[PDB]
Design a protein around this nucleic acid. Structure first.
Ligand SMILES: Nc1ncnc2c1ncn2[C@@H]1O[C@H](COP(=O)(O)OP(=O)(O)OP(=O)(O)O)[C@@H](O)[C@H]1O
Ligand SMILES: Nc1ncnc2c1ncn2[C@@H]1O[C@H](COP(=O)(O)OP(=O)(O)OP(=O)(O)O)[C@@H](O)[C@H]1O
Ligand SMILES: [Mg+2]
Ligand SMILES: [Mg+2]
Length: 115
DNA sequence: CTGTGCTCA
């Protein structure tokens, strides 16, 4: 598991914009995107705003900030909502969820921007 | 594969 994070975090950081997380919400919240994705990125709410599934709320937000070119997982973990299953995961592990979700989300974005 | 998630084949 830890080796799967190690190979992802190397490819994600080499594709990252190199900006700290404070720039992610600062550059998105000053724009005029739909209020739904804006409410999540500006950290004002989470999946509870739209009553969406906790996994889908983290899925749509991770893909969106990847369209802005941000890719580094250290920011994915920092913005990760504390109301998610990543809070306690009594039958799970937070790193298992984080490795699976970013592996899938990154695969979908990088294949969308491939050339 | 794992709890499943998209947008787009
Ligand atoms: N619409 C909802 N969105 C988010 N959480 C919900 C919702 N309805 C109930 N919950 C609560 O949050 C957890 C998820 O319930 P739900 O039945 O939505 O499961 P799920 O759709 O398989 O997973 P998740 O929505 O957590 O990705 C449960 O503890 C439940 O009590
Ligand atoms: N019979 C079961 N009843 C409940 N959960 C089960 C069962 N079998 C497997 N599970 C796993 O346990 C999970 C629910 O407990 P878990 O503590 O992991 O989540 P949570 O309590 O909703 O989130 P958090 O622990 O972050 O608050 C389910 O999503 C599922 O993956
Ligand atoms: Mg749900
Ligand atoms: Mg729990």
């Amino acid at each position: 598991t830890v080796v799967e994070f190690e190979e992802l975090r190397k490819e994600l950081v080499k594709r990252d914009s190199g900006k700290p997380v404070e720039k992610i919400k600062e550059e998105i919240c000053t724009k005029s995107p739909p209020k739904l994705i804006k409410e999540i990125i500006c950290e004002n709410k989470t999946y509870a705003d739209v009553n969406i599934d906790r996994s889908r709320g983290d899925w749509h937000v991770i893909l969106y900030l990847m369209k802005h070119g941000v890719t580094d997982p250290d920011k994915i973990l920092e913005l990760l909502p504390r109301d998610s299953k990543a809070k306690e995961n009594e039958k799970w592990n937070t790193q298992k969820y984080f490795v699976i979700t970013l592996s899938k989300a990154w695969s979908v974005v990088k294949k969308y921007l491939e050339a």
